[PDB]
């Protein structure tokens, strides 16, 4: 695995940054990102997937609309549900609605779900080096909220499962000034941090960085 | 915790009260009522493209209200907006999302 890795640089593999508003649908943005990338990595066709869908329907997979979720379970949702449509047909609204899923509209699909083993940050690097941008959930703090640039370290956050509260998308990795970090896409718009992206301390499972990470295997 | 749930609930802290006090005028502009002292008692948090606050404020005496405020990211400007409120709440009542 190379010391560096930028999925955004390899080609046209990362979809625009976007925000989830006051709705707790970060996991869905975590979800949509992994899958838009994969299909892009496999087909070269760039598509934007509707997070609203996961908000209105990924219920049977332990998700909870604007009140919580997890990429892995949502990934299962799209396998079993036979797909996900885009936005132009299922636009973002940031609130719990009722399911408007329409089969003949799905434009992206999922064959398998590769769940990185618990706390195995190394495997996460493997998956990102050879396969696809990974979705994970760390532990945010008011501390993290002020991020503007640089490698975000943290002593206030604990690592364990419990305080894990914000899924995002690992899109690369590297090292600067001797400090190995993760390049990450966030779901808060092109104004926060490094244009939606933020760098975070790698190598120490920073803020439970690999407690529940996974990536999709698109059926294409 | 799930990646987007509300946190477990913790006792109200001095900043929560600031939030409720800064917010009290909005309850009123919406319910056109006038409350005495609205004491924060408990709250839960939820990370979004900011933070949503779920506070249990004692605004009467033996009567509790549940406010929901949204505090923006430290870079997008603006203040605490009361996004919703639940009238008639028991002291024991679990704070929930909405």
């Amino acid at each position: 695995y190379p010391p560096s890795m930028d999925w955004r640089k390899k080609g046209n593999f990362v979809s625009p940054v976007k925000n989830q508003g006051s709705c707790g649908s970060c996991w869905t943005f975590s979800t949509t990102g992994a899958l838009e990338s994969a299909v892009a990595i496999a087909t070269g066709k760039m598509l934007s997937l509707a997070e609203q869908q996961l908000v209105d329907c990924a219920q049977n997979f332990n998700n909870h609309g604007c009140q919580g979720g997890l990429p892995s379970q949502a990934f299962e949702y799209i396998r079993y549900n036979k797909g996900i449509m885009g936005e132009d047909t299922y636009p973002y609204k940031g609130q719990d609605d009722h399911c408007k899923f329409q089969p003949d509209k799905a434009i992206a699909f999922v064959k398998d779900v590769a769940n990185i083993t618990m706390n195995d940050e190394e495997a996460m690097v493997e998956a990102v080096a050879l396969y696809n941008p990974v979705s994970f959930a760390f532990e945010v703090t008011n501390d993290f909220l002020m991020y503007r640039k640089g490698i975000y370290s943290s002593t206030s956050c604990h690592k364990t499962p419990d305080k894990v509260n914000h899924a995002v998308l690992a899109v690369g990795y590297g090292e600067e000034n001797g400090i190995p970090y993760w390049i990450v896409k966030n779901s808060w718009g092109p104004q926060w941090g490094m244009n939606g992206y933020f760098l975070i301390e790698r190598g120490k499972n920073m803020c439970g960085l690999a407690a529940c990470a996974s990536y999709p295997i698109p059926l294409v | 915790m799930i990646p987007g749930g509300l946190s477990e609930a913790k006792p109200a802290t001095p900043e929560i009260q600031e939030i409720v006090d800064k917010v009290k005028p909005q309850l009123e502009e919406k319910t056109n009522e006038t409350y005495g002292k609205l004491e924060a008692v408990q709250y839960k948090t939820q990370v979004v493209a900011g933070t949503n606050y779920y506070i249990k404020v004692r605004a009467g005496d033996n009567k509790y209200m549940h406010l929901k405020v949204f505090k923006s990211l430290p870079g997008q400007n603006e203040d605490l907006v009361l996004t919703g409120y639940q009238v008639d709440k028991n002291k024991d009542d679990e704070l929930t999302g909405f």
């Binding site: 332990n62 998700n63 919580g68 892995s72 769940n115 618990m118 499962p161 894990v164 529940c212 | 990646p3």
Partner: peptide, 8 residues
């Protein structure tokens, strides 16, 4: 198995 992060 079921990834541990999702509950609720």
């Amino acid at each position: 198995e079921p990834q541990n992060c999702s509950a609720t």
